[PDB]
Amino acid sequence: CYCSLRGDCYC
């Protein structure tokens, strides 16, 4: 579960 600024924001 991570919300980065490239393409991460879910689990």
Side-chain angles (χ1 to χ4, degrees):
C1 294
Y2 215 109
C3 243
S4 314
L5 271 161
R6 302 82 42 101
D8 294 306
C9 251
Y10 57 77
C11 302

